[model samples]
Target: DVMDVMNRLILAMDLMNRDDALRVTGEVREYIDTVKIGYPLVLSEGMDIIAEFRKRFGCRIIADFKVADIPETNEKICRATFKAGADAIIVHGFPGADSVRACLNVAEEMGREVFLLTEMSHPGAEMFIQGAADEIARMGVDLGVKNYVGPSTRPERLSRLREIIGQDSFLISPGVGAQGGDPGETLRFADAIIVGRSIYLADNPAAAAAGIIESIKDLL
Candidate 1:
């Protein structure tokens, strides 16, 4: 998967795969490999899937569940997700402090990290996260979470959130290229960002990722 995220590649078709779906596994990988977007082949086609892919091509894998729920459920999910061998897990701060804590606790226990959803890049998120920096930051502090997921366009605007949580927090900023978010602004505030459409939908996916990565190599 590009940038340690692996679920929505190729139109999120993996979510629709069924046990008996016609050549679903074969077709998915065939198409996925055609592009640079990859998935937890373990998640999409079973654990052996990733092993085979790595054996052949040595591609990285990721999971994109976007976990959000109560403390107990989120903790269990975090544990299970990491145990399954995912490189990273997505968590939603909107679920409240305890939920975020649960995921972070699991991340701590598993010695891994997480991406906290603060502001989604879609048009609708502007209605909320754009203004909830204070509230979100307070919650992040309570949960001892550093990472955030603010928009790439106005990430610096999240200074309050970053101030509360500390600047070292990773930020999974998305929305670029086809999605319309700005990397320059995101780099100012985010330590590590997310690049989806900009890479996945690019005429040259690797170049697209490298370009963005290079642009922000020092900012982050």
Candidate 2:
């Protein structure tokens, strides 16, 4: 049951330097299954950081680019992201079907993964993420995407998102810890959870991640 959607943790490597990112990964890799490199690292260290992490930590790398652009540009970004050693990449659904499809096409051809953004965990996220999630999720299904980004802070929406994406597709829930999402409850629907400041900013990064992992080990 390799495909079983268990509650696994994903470390959000939002740190800006190679040393700090590697340090956190070394400390927390045992508890987390993947590492999400967001804008800060990508912009500061470039895609080479992906390869560096893989070589040093041997952990899965996910480029949280939240890619948004035209079809051509999006495709190029996806291709580049994969080539740079990311196992998966996140794309913005706000760019519409064409952009998402383009990235999906490239991901499929390259044997990489793409996760579509549905909503954020921030306070004003409703301003743009409220009504658009269902449609974006439906579009992702149509494009053969099997992973999506949803907010752990909003547990009520998790069931609906899981319904829309289908049981086979996995959901990546962020915003746990520092963002105010309950790790145990969020795991009820999320196949995987993403945490940033909670672990990265903690005095003991490994201990912080281990605590969350211990709480979710029984969840499916």
Candidate 3:
């Protein structure tokens, strides 16, 4: 419910530098208005980068912090992120309900939103995360979380997560393109798709985004 990103796409701007990351995201801004900025860019250029994106493109920034910490620390991170102007912050549900709740509390006070990440989008995640993902998702629902990030590599898994969170909660998926997930299929269960290297690393970032938008036009 928090985003209206173009074509239901959110740019995972994981690029590590200021110039190239800004240039690439600016090119695809027409196709996506929500940009997920993680530590790669945040550490490189500092949190001020979030403000830069807002000023340059009017993008709704999601700080992909994957916040996993004790309750107190999680609150501090959320406060700093929202103070820096993030529209929403992504927190790890595996950290337990108290930790996730810490972020949710800060979000409520700041008038921002939180996205609980139930699972990671990589092969290694299957080792330990897959085992706990279901319970973590349930914990989020128990805590009244309304936004979630699920893996896009497996449509069944994503669909199952949709079932767990139910109809009203907002869901977003990652792992499309470079990670072997189909944009159209991912959207079958995701309210929005989180795309990374596929667009950022392309020869024509804007064209790549446009192609994906066209491919998923029916869903949009």
Candidate 4:
């Protein structure tokens, strides 16, 4: 595995404000050691929050930028994000290998990691990403990319992506909780499950995280 997330759960820290995000994250530190910080939080609180999170929670941060752009721009984005203290970056695969390569090169140079996002967890993605998902997974393997992100909302598709990536590669799945994905079934194929709304939005986030962990403790 690229990195071990405690309980096989990476808290999706998308709560836009620094105060609430930090508080909620702290409450669940016992359950997770990795946090996925996306544009909503980084754009709102600043990239410094990434380092801040590390200093405060000491968790590995995944900058879920969904980074997609031309090769030149992609490299710059990856460099800036890694420099900002991200352990790994989430890059879009639909943009093609040249674009994905831009991230891989930067991540390699920085001694970090890149997660090829083949299929997203959304209804609209079915129209396009579903068709291209397999090819993207193949591209990732051809590029020697070992880490990936798939949709937990579709276990069958997740299994197919798993088969493509192979048993040794590390894969993390999202679309759990608020997205209506089942944690246990997702774990059948994914190394880790990305959880957000179900925990972060709960009246008691720590309890929420604990409950989810309890539900799937055996898998972990």
Please list the Cα RMSD from the true structure of every candidate, rounded to 1 decimal place: 6.7, 1.8, 0.8, 0.7
lDDT of 3: 0.93
lDDT (10s digit) by residue, model 1, range 1-220: 1243322222222322333222333333432321111243335566444344344443344455667778999888777767766556767777787788788878888977776766566667778766775676667766666556666555555455566667555555555556665666655665445554555445655565556656755554
Q: How many backbone clashes does candidate 3 have?
A: 0
Report lDDT per candidate.
0.55, 0.85, 0.93, 0.95
Candidate 2's residue-wise lDDT over 122-152, tens digit each?
A: 8888888867888888888888788888989
Arranged by lDDT with the best first, the candidates are: 4, 3, 2, 1
Worst 10 residues of 2 by lDDT: 1-10
Q: Write the per-residue lDDT of candidate 3 for residues 142-203, one digit (tens) a residue.
A: 99999999999978889989999998999999999999999999988999999999999999
- Taking all chains together, the TM-score of candidate 1 against the true structure is 0.67
The TM-score values for the models, in the order shown, are 0.67, 0.94, 0.98, 0.99
Compose the digit string of candidate 4's lDDT tens values, residues 1-220: 4687789999999999899999999999988999999999999999999989999987999999999999999999999999999999999999999999999999999999999999988999999999999999999999999999999999999999999999999999999989999999999999999999999999999999999999998886
Clashing pairs in 1: none
Q: Provide the lowest-lDDT 10-residue window in model 1.
A: 7-16
Best by TM-score: 4
Instruction: Show how many residue pairs clash in every candidate, following the order shown.
Output: 0, 0, 0, 0
| lDDT of the structure predicted as candidate 4 | 0.95
